[PDB]
Amino acid sequence: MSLIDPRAIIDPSARLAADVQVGPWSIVGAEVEIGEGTVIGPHVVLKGPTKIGKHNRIYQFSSVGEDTPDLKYKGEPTRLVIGDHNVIREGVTIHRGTVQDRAETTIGDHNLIMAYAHIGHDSVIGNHCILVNNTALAGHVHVDDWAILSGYTLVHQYCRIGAHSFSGMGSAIGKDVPAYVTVFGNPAEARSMNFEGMRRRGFSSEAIHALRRAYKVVYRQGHTVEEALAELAESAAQFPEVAVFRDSIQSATRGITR
Amino acid sequence: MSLIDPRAIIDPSARLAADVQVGPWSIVGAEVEIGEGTVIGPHVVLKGPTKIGKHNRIYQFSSVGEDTPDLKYKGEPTRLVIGDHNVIREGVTIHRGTVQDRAETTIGDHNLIMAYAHIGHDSVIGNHCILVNNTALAGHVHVDDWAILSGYTLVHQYCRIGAHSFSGMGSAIGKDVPAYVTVFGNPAEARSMNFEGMRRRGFSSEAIHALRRAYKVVYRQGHTVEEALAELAESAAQFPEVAVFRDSIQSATRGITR
Amino acid sequence: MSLIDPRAIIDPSARLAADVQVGPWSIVGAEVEIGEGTVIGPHVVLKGPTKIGKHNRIYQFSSVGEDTPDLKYKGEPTRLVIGDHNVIREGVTIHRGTVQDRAETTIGDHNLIMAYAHIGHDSVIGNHCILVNNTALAGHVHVDDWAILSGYTLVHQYCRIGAHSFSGMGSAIGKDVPAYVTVFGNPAEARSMNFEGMRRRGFSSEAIHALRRAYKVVYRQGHTVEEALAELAESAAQFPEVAVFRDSIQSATRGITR
Numbered sequence A, B, C: 001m002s003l004i005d006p007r008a009i010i011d012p013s014a015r016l017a018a019d020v021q022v023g024p025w026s027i028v029g030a031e032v033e034i035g036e037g038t039v040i041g042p043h044v045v046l047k048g049p050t051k052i053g054k055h056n057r058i059y060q061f062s063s064v065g066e067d068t069p070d071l072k073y074k075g076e077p078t079r080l081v082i083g084d085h086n087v088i089r090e091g092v093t094i095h096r097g098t099v100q101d102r103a104e105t106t107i108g109d110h111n112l113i114m115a116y117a118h119i120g121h122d123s124v125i126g127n128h129c130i131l132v133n134n135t136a137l138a139g140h141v142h143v144d145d146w147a148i149l150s151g152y153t154l155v156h157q158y159c160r161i162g163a164h165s166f167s168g169m170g171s172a173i174g175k176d177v178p179a180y181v182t183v184f185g186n187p188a189e190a191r192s193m194n195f196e197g198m199r200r201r202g203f204s205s206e207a208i209h210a211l212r213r214a215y216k217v218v219y220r221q222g223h224t225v226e227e228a229l230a231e232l233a234e235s236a237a238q239f240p241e242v243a244v245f246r247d248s249i250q251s252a253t254r255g256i257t258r
């Protein structure tokens, strides 16, 4: 019968587009905004200030928009922003981040965040990412587009997870993961690149070839990071996809996973 | 108090035996069937098409019968079947599986699926199994009778867990685990055989001895798998419990955990 | 707004201080006692016999006071006791323990038990401890004061975790961790001591020095545990912090994490 179930609790300051659905026993707290086409399941807790975009789905037992730990001071404004076409499965926890220092927690578009995954404060997820069951981002974690974190992947605070990268199940990531790289184990170790994912995306053969060579430059020829960046310079100018790889290594603050 | 709490939602398509109990704020969805003596706690989400048998117990915050990701086409029929005398603890997630290709998700009888454990699509659990807290079966996983997967055990798609086998806590299983074998670590490694389980089952002392010999044949004498199967043939003809072990090795598709 | 939400269920045997808050769709079961200033969120399940103290916060989807597995006999009395100023985040599970053999499950004061963490039967946690997300104590685990168990730390039954000790993310602890010791990995290995924590607690620089020397006596000088205890004796009599360390090694029942 009604799009907003009568058993849900909707705070008067929440703002919901006219077609939003909310299931029974869900709570949509103060300062939570929900855009067109989004479906909130039953037994969902939403807390704000939080903006959720269009055409999202949030499943049962999720807590989205929770308090950030250790604020600089009491009542520093925080925020969580979720874009469009995302799926947040059961039991997921997502915390807000601080606004003043531009460290909101942010999730882009077309992401899949699977059961019991955890998105810690100030983390930023791009587009078309997949965080499989029980993945946990500790805090201040940046996950660039098309990355796949397999089940039970744990990510240390401040780590960057490169575009189109891949972690194996149960991986424990302490350092940055360069774009395209595949990591496994606890502690995580680089193995290869996700050539599969490149093909599914339609990369040319020449760019794949140039990425395979780039992997060897960084990981298999005894170079220092500095020497590898200088050697990749030329290929990175020719192939935007190698520039993605090179740029991910240059902006690494915690060293790269090796 | 009524057996179906008045605050629970029971879909007009669901079919329940007359003595079934359902707690407050629980949803028994469309196309769910629940047999005699089952108790559903509070805050449970059941979705279908799902058959739950007799004398089961399903605890709070569990999502039992969720959607399979792996559909060939929109509305391909899918199903989850749970047998009798099972206990499904809090927070457990169980996905359905496809009917057409005989790949339904199936759980037999007398199983214990402990908190936050995850049973992915198309998986098949036998009888008298224990999946400890946070165990995850990614998909297409077969758990044979009496197996124990210790807490936080992660199992790769398509793996077979043999009868009476055991995994140590935090194990990450990528290959098949032969019957009776104990495995540990990330990545998992074979260590020994579950002699304790054998004695709790009543095995004769000759059969336990033959199984200890069989472990060494496969794992300690430098034999190939082909060589080991040939050498086990004789003992397997004498002892049904050694045939279990031999048969588990012969039907391995991902290699055996070593 | 009423302190006890009209949608919560409060068993007539439960005993609450007058100012206790209890959110919608929460169950305070039989034999649950709750003290002054404690706040129970929505969607919380409390079962007894369980005592919760003063100024505690228990978040959504938590099951606090659950049954102990395999009691000596049906209806052997069990209990869980939680002290004051504790925070129990979402999805946390805490089981009771047996009363007769002094094995209740007990939690002291000023503890932070983060999302989806698990406290198994007969476990004892002191004061000012942090169990990060998804930390799991299997059963009969003792956690001394100021310990920090990072996310996804798994603890085998009967282990003791010493005061001021630290585990890295994803650690799988199978033996005792001495006080102050930092451990990492699956299986866990000792790396150093938590000198940071000592500084934040205000230890004198002479006591930190004596603890650094004590670490080397146990771990870096080829001594047996017996030898090391004899050599530490003198410093332990002079510094109460080194006695903490020595006493944690002497009372180890599963060997120490090395």
Ligand SMILES: CNC(=O)CN(Cc1ccc(-n2cncn2)cc1)C(=O)CSc1ccccc1Cl
Residues within 6 Å of the ligand: A112, A130, A132, A133, A148, A149, A150, A151, A152, A169, B069, B118, B120, B136, B137, B138, B139, B154, B155, B156, B157
């Ligand atoms: C189906 N493929 C796998 O399950 C491999 N995989 C990566 C992965 C997983 C799922 C997806 N998608 C789901 N909907 C769309 N995409 C994509 C890649 C794992 O993480 C395995 S571990 C694991 C897996 C599931 C639960 C618990 C655990 Cl531990």
Ligand SMILES: CNC(=O)CN(Cc1ccc(-n2cncn2)cc1)C(=O)CSc1ccccc1Cl
Residues within 6 Å of the ligand: B112, B130, B132, B133, B148, B149, B150, B151, B152, B169, C069, C070, C118, C120, C136, C137, C138, C139, C154, C155, C156, C157
């Ligand atoms: C009591 N034995 C253990 O706790 C050993 N165990 C195997 C095991 C565990 C339980 C059972 N049963 C429970 N009811 C009946 N059987 C049987 C074997 C583990 O998985 C340890 S780890 C762990 C354990 C519990 C929670 C989280 C974690 Cl991480």
Ligand SMILES: CNC(=O)CN(Cc1ccc(-n2cncn2)cc1)C(=O)CSc1ccccc1Cl
Residues within 6 Å of the ligand: A069, A070, A118, A120, A136, A137, A138, A139, A154, A155, A156, A157, C112, C130, C132, C133, C148, C149, C150, C151, C152, C169
């Ligand atoms: C901020 N520090 C860290 O996040 C480091 N940490 C220890 C730690 C963590 C939190 C706290 N507190 C929170 N409120 C007060 N204290 C203190 C120490 C981890 O366990 C990282 S792993 C992890 C972290 C969080 C979620 C999932 C995972 Cl997997």
Ligand SMILES: [Cl-]
Residues within 6 Å of the ligand: A017, A034, A035, A036, A054
């Ligand atoms: Cl909108």
Ligand SMILES: [Cl-]
Residues within 6 Å of the ligand: A089, A090, A114, A115, A133
């Ligand atoms: Cl999921």
Ligand SMILES: [Cl-]
Residues within 6 Å of the ligand: A068, A069, A095, A119, A120, A121, A138, A139
């Ligand atoms: Cl956080």
Ligand SMILES: [Cl-]
Residues within 6 Å of the ligand: A150, A167, A168, A169
């Ligand atoms: Cl993997």
Ligand SMILES: [Cl-]
Residues within 6 Å of the ligand: A182, A191, A192, A193
């Ligand atoms: Cl790879």
Ligand SMILES: [Cl-]
Residues within 6 Å of the ligand: A196, A197, A200
């Ligand atoms: Cl692929």
Ligand SMILES: [Cl-]
Residues within 6 Å of the ligand: A201
């Ligand atoms: Cl792309």
Ligand SMILES: [Cl-]
Residues within 6 Å of the ligand: B034, B035, B036, B052, B053, B054
């Ligand atoms: Cl039935």
Ligand SMILES: [Cl-]
Residues within 6 Å of the ligand: B047, B065, B066, B067
């Ligand atoms: Cl679903």
Ligand SMILES: [Cl-]
Residues within 6 Å of the ligand: B089, B090, B114, B115, B133
């Ligand atoms: Cl459980």
Ligand SMILES: [Cl-]
Residues within 6 Å of the ligand: B067, B068, B069, B095, B119, B120, B121, B138, B139
């Ligand atoms: Cl699934």
Ligand SMILES: [Cl-]
Residues within 6 Å of the ligand: B182, B191, B192, B193
């Ligand atoms: Cl073993």
Ligand SMILES: [Cl-]
Residues within 6 Å of the ligand: C034, C035, C036, C052, C053, C054
């Ligand atoms: Cl009190």
